[PDB]
Amino acid sequence: MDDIYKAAVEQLTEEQKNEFKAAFDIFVLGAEDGSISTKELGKVMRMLGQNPTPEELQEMIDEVDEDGSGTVDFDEFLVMMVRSMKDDSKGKFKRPTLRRVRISADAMMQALLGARAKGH
Numbered sequence: 001m002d003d004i005y006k007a008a009v010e011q012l013t014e015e016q017k018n019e020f021k022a023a024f025d026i027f028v029l030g031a032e033d034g035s036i037s038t039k040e041l042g043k044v045m046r047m048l049g050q051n052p053t054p055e056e057l058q059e060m061i062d063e064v065d066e067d068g069s070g071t072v073d074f075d076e077f078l079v080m081m082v083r084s085m086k087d088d089s090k091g092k093f094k095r096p097t098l099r100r101v102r103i104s105a106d107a108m109m110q111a112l113l114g115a116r117a118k119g120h
């Protein structure tokens with residue numbers, strides 16, 4: 001979990017984290033635990049035209065998966081959210097978390113966010 005971004009949620013406005021939450025919640029549409037498992041994650045990706053495999057998906061979850069549960073919950077999602085929209089490490093040091101299927105902040109969000117999305 002990028003503690004830089006982990007601060008950035010601490011740095012996001014109320015609206016900021018509120019919006020992002022929704023995407024989490026809809027990422028977990030009908031989920032029993034309501035945390036994003038790999039196929040919960042994969043759902044949205046396929047909602048975006050992606051077609052991951054859990055392996056890929058897991059590495060996305062694994063970042064913030066502090067409990068080692070294989071599921072992202074809100075703040076876990078949220079820090080990736082601000083991570084996704086910032087990702088300032090363009091041409092310098094960063095560790096690769098599988099450039100397999102990279103979900104875009106808004107593009108992914110919009111898939112869930114047919115409710116308060118910038119687009120639809």
Ligand SMILES: Cc1cccc(Nc2ccccc2)c1
Binds near residue numbers: 063103
């Ligand atoms: C490469 C990488 C690292 C961390 C997170 C994600 N994406 C993601 C998006 C939504 C839910 C879970 C994960 C991708």
